Design a protein around this ligand. Structure first.
Ligand SMILES: [Cl-]
Lengths: 8, 309
């Protein structure tokens, strides 16, 4: 279960 | 209202002029910018991009710039010694891209169409005529704090060099995170710094198999070199003390400059409080920010000063 840096 | 009476009444001191960068303190230069002069400048919302700008207003040593062709809602204020503006023609002489006016390139043709005057060259502190920062070349790589998400230290590149400053870009992100700095910025470090420090390095956006990112491989695959370690200089912490007073541009109405206090301090940052206002309005600012000034700056430069609320 991956956590991803999102900027939108 | 006067500073003297106010300091007497509050039993307070102003931050000595010596505490500031020369550029923040200087009051003896006149503002030579005039209404309608045209020039080139960085978009503060996109610091890698250059636009044609027109002088919309002048107040003391400050000026309000308008993006030709775009809405006046994007107008912004700079000081007359800003290094983020350049004379007409600077882009082509120096290898920079100039965005044209909205919808619209040749300056001679545009000046003929508009019957406007370009701001004269002598007004500009930055014309790419001074010795660049040694060791910082376009294309080189480093590690940089994302100043907007400062828990992150990230893979970064130098993408522009202008006089004493260079532009730091976050690989694979947009330019909204970019910032201009110099070799002593506390926000930059050599390739390998995070590894030395036992700190996680944030790799480029969408880098395949990011947990296995390796600088050695990244540099090889990008044909890039690291900024040499000797090029990074240690900036001393500033010497502002809590309760010291000064002047500061209001971020909520940038036209205004207010009587201010040092509320709190870090090594390189200062928490500003507007005397008389709610602490809700307090904000952190880097000590080198062009929008803080010693007491007396407004009065000496011919800009109104808002006294405490
Ligand atoms: Cl617009």
């Amino acid at each position: 279960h991956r956590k991803v840096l999102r900027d939108n | 209202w006067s500073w003297e009476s106010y300091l007497e009444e509050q039993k307070a001191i102003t931050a000595p002029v010596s505490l500031f960068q020369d550029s923040q303190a200087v009051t003896h230069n006149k503002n030579g910018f005039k209404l309608g002069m045209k020039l080139e400048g960085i978009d503060p919302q996109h610091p890698s991009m250059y636009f044609i700008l027109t002088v919309a207003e002048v107040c003391g040593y400050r000026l309000r710039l308008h993006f030709d062709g775009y809405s006046e809602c994007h107008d912004f204020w700079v000081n007359a010694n800003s290094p983020d503006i350049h004379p007409a023609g600077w882009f082509e002489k120096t290898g920079h891209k100039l965005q044209p006016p909205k919808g619209y390139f040749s300056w001679s043709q545009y000046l003929r169409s508009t019957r406007a005057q370009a701001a004269p060259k002598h007004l500009f502190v930055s014309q790419s005529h001074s010795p660049p920062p040694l060791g910082f070349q376009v294309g080189m790589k480093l590690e940089a704090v994302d100043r907007m998400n400062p828990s992150l230290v990230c893979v970064a590149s130098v993408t522009d060099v202008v006089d004493s400053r260079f532009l730091v870009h976050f690989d694979n992100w947009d330019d909204t995170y970019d910032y201009w700095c110099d070799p002593s910025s506390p926000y930059i470090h050599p390739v390998g710094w995070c590894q030395k420090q036992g700190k996680p390095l944030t790799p480029p956006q969408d880098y395949p198999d990011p947990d296995n990112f390796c600088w050695e491989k990244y540099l090889e695959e990008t044909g890039a070199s690291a900024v040499p370690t000797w090029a990074f200089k240690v900036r001393p912490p500033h010497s502002f003390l809590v309760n010291m007073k000064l002047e500061a541009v209001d971020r909520r109405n940038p036209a205004l400059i207010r009587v201010a206090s040092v509320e709190d301090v870090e090594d390189h940052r200062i928490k500003i409080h507007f005397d008389g206002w709610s602490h809700g309005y307090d904000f952190w600012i880097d000590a080198d920010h062009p929008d803080i000034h010693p007491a007396g700056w407004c009065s000496k430069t011919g800009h109104p000063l808002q006294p405490p609320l």
